[PDB]
């Protein structure tokens, strides 16, 4: 994974690549690393895949119940506090490395969380194996007072750095824009710069190529 | 302390009866009648819904007849909420057996365990018993078709034909009169409906005040099918036997 978060004028934008690996093997070429905690709070996750998904769902579930209990829109700091305390409790064994962002009645926010439970604050952040490629771009092109379209460009450029330069990252760029006063817009496969070229040959076999010993109808009805 | 307010639900009367069990049975005697009849080629379950309102949704409704697994069903008489607690336990128990032995649970084993749970609430814990009597209808490859009943005491018995709830005394006399051993399912369907029709506290027996189910081997070859009757199917079977 490469994941980033970038603050702008009236909100925050996060982005991620879509590669999932098992050692040197690409397990999933188009996996979703952007997670919805609440409608306007979203999480980018690197690390152990099942962990980032599960911890994001649990806190998301509890955030929904909290929102219903308090008759209030959930705050990013609540998701941040709940995630960090859960991760700290498990002493790093839950390998979730998260960039938490969103808008709430208090304003727009951007945080990162380490698997051991420490948190950061910043205008631009990157996590994952491709974070050094991403951060190199962010440190080169970031400035104060970014517009929405500038921040999306910067964020996706930072993800691209990871896609091309980090073997842990690849395929596509997902983006989510959280602007104050508006609905969060999830941009699934915002960029797809890794489309497979046409194959040289069709490997469709002549029917009857495979030797068969038995046939039978399977009953799926009651 | 709190001793003052303890009803002592699990004690004997001077006559050696369990107060709470007796009073639970008294409660059940006001619940809608449910009848089970076991034929040689299947089982019938018939039950009367408790005084219906015209605005009640009849098709998406379940009050009397519940499915425990693919081979076993129950007819309920008493508090429905109490029955659902027990039904869920019974459903889980059936799956535990299937997971353990890779075979569907024999009917009696399921009936015994559910009856044992009821028994416990009469001997320890200081809680009120479940105000429920079940009619169990099911099939297994050991005894074939079986009818059982259990009541709040946790006592269970096997039957050829049986009723629970209201007017059991009159219902049993009628079943005892017209039942014979070589009976078929379709005959049993008729007997069940005829008995309810005569014992009912309502003016006339209609489709909207009934739940009906059969357990036949009337699938295709050596296997058992559970049929929980739809409203229209009860309307038809009520016409077919000339009750309406």
């Amino acid at each position: 994974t490469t994941i980033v978060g970038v603050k702008f004028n009236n909100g925050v934008v996060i982005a991620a690549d879509t590669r999932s690996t098992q050692g040197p093997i690409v397990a999933d070429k188009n996996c979703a690393k952007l997670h919805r905690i609440s409608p306007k709070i979203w999480c980018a996750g690197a690390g152990t895949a099942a962990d980032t998904e599960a911890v994001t769902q649990l806190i998301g579930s509890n955030i929904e119940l909290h929102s219903l209990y308090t008759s209030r829109e959930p705050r990013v700091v609540s998701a941040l506090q709940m995630l960090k305390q859960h991760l700290f409790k498990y002493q790093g064994h839950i390998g979730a490395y998260l960039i938490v962002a969103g808008v709430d009645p208090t304003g727009s926010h951007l945080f990162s969380i380490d698997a051991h439970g420490s948190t950061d604050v910043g205008y631009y952040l990157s996590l994952g194996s491709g974070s050094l490629a991403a951060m190199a771009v962010l440190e080169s092109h970031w400035k104060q007072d970014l517009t929405k379209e500038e921040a999306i460009k910067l964020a996706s450029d930072a993800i691209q750095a990871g896609i091309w330069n980090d073997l842990g990252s690849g395929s596509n760029v997902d983006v989510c824009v959280m602007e104050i006063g508006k609905d969060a817009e999830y941009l699934r496969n915002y960029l797809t710069p890794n489309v497979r070229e046409e194959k040289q040959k069709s490997y469709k076999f002549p029917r009857g190529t495979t030797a068969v010993l038995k046939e039978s109808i399977v009953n799926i009805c009651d | 302390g709190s001793r003052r307010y303890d009803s002592r639900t699990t004690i004997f009367s001077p006559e050696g009866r369990l107060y709470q069990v007796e009073y639970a049975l008294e409660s059940i005697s006001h619940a809608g009648t449910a009848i089970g009849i076991m034929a040689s080629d299947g089982i019938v379950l018939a039950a009367e819904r408790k005084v219906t309102s015209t605005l009640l949704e009849q098709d998406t409704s379940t009050e009397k007849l519940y499915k425990l697994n693919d081979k076993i069903a129950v007819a309920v008489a008493g508090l429905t909420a109490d029955a659902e607690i027990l039904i869920n336990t019974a459903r889980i128990h059936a799956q535990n057996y299937l997971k353990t032995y890779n075979e569907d649970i024999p009917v009696e084993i399921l009936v015994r365990r559910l009856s044992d749970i009821k028994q416990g609430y009469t001997q320890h814990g200081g809680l009120r018993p479940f105000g429920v009597s079940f009619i169990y209808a099911g099939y297994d490859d050991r005894y074939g078709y079986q009818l059982y009943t259990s009541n709040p005491s946790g006592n269970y018995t096997g039957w050829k034909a049986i009723s629970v709830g209201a007017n059991t005394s009159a219902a049993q006399t009628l079943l005892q009169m017209d039942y014979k051993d070589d009976m078929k399912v379709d005959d049993a369907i008729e007997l069940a409906l005829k008995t309810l029709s005569k014992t009912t506290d309502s003016s006339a027996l209609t489709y909207d005040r009934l739940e009906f189910a059969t357990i036949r081997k009337g699938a295709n070859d050596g296997e058992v099918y559970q049929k929980i009757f739809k409203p229209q199917e009860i309307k038809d079977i009520l016409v077919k036997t000339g009750i309406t």
Partner: protein, 196 residues
């Protein structure tokens, strides 16, 4: 990390660099290691980021509940709560914390709590990996009852040297001034402090 807290005439000032690392990679170059556990009781954090954050959060909770019942806690009390957490969980913690606060009765006070969870009340305290390089300098230059401007310069020059030699330290020099007047945040950038 390089962190320190220094008492002076009008109260106490806390100081810290802004570098967080994992090996030789700087995970955060603008970290805030100066943390509020109460209005005028703050701490400098060193060691594990996760541990020191978790501790500071618990302490802030304890002092908030203390204040609700018994009013403003003493700086000593805040240090005791830090100690209790650090001492009883010494096997599972990597936290070197300096506690600093301002009373009106007691004025400025500094307590340092090393790895084991012992407490040490001092006129000034230095801690973190970068502190090693300024023991000589700080001992030679510290005076009691310094002015605000003198104490700012002492911390600035000290952390400048700690940053210069310690690879784990760097970024900006943050400072928090605790006096009767209130709470003041100061920041000093590389272009100023590097050429001192």
């Amino acid at each position: 990390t390089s962190i320190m807290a220094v008492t002076f005439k009008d109260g106490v000032i806390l100081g810290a660099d802004s570098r967080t690392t994992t090996g030789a990679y700087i995970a955060n170059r603008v970290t805030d290691k100066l943390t509020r556990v109460h209005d005028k009781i703050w701490c400098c954090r060193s060691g594990s980021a996760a541990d020191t954050q978790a501790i500071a959060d618990i302490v802030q909770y304890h002092l908030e509940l203390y204040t609700s019942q018994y009013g403003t806690p003493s700086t000593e009390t805040a240090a005791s709560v830090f100690k209790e957490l650090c001492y009883e969980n010494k096997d599972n913690l990597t936290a070197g914390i300096i506690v600093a606060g301002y009373d009106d009765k007691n004025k400025g006070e500094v307590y340092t709590i090393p790895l084991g969870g012992s407490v040490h009340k001092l006129p000034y305290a230095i801690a973190g990996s970068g502190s090693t390089f300024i023991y000589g300098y700080c001992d030679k230059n510290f005076r009691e009852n310094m002015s605000k401007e003198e104490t700012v310069d002492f911390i600035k020059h000290s952390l400048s040297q700690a940053i210069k030699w310690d690879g784990s330290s760097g970024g900006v020099i943050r400072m928090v001034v605790l006096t009767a007047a209130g709470v003041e945040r100061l920041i000093f950038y590389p272009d100023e402090y590097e050429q001192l």
